[PDB]
Write a protein that binds this ligand. Structure first.
Ligand SMILES: [Mg+2]
Ligand SMILES: [Mg+2]
Ligand SMILES: [Mg+2]
Length: 117
RNA sequence: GCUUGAGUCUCGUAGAGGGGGGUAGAAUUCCAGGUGUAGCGGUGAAAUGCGUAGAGAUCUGGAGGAAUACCGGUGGCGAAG
């Protein structure tokens, strides 16, 4: 076991799902939870409520580490991004800093074709 | 014969105009390794499909190909494309 001050939490917010993972600052995984794993299937999985419950599940799953003064980084355009940080605060974790990062390609390569619906 | 059309010379200016050779950084994919463990992905709603031979997530290194966020315009160049 270990007690980690200044651990890093990763938020990946797809349109269809949300993933929460806790790693040491060098990216070594400590614990992870998910909306789909929270007892959700299909369209329910994109709701911000699902993200909140997923964040609580992640926090509880990793309690055995003495994690304090958390840092949170968020990626993706999906919904419920803010809800996860609210959850980690509510879980009791102390949050020092918060950052956004999402890959931009600088016109790298071709995306799929437009959707006629 | 003439200098008003047309052309030559001297000095400057702007430009994604054209051909050849180098080089840069962001990103998708693949491969190796560490962390790690059971879902991911998708949709109107699903299923097909992918993962315990270790996926997805996250971190380190390597390979290859193609296009050049922002500036950027209500802009410029070209006989047209
Ligand atoms: Mg050129
Ligand atoms: Mg492998
Ligand atoms: Mg013109």
């Amino acid at each position: 076991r270990k007690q980690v001050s200044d651990g890093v939490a990763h938020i990946h917010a797809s349109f269809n799902n949300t993933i929460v993972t806790i790693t040491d600052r060098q990216g070594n995984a400590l614990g992870w939870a998910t909306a789909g794993g929270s007892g959700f299937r299909g369209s329910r999985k994109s709701t911000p409520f699902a993200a909140q419950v997923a964040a609580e599940r992640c926090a509880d799953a990793v309690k055995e580490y003495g994690i304090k003064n958390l840092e949170v980084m968020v990626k993706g355009p999906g919904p419920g991004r803010e809800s996860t940080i609210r959850a980690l605060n509510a879980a009791g974790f102390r949050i020092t800093n918060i950052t956004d990062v999402t890959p931009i390609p600088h016109n790298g390569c071709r995306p799929p074709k437009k959707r006629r619906v």
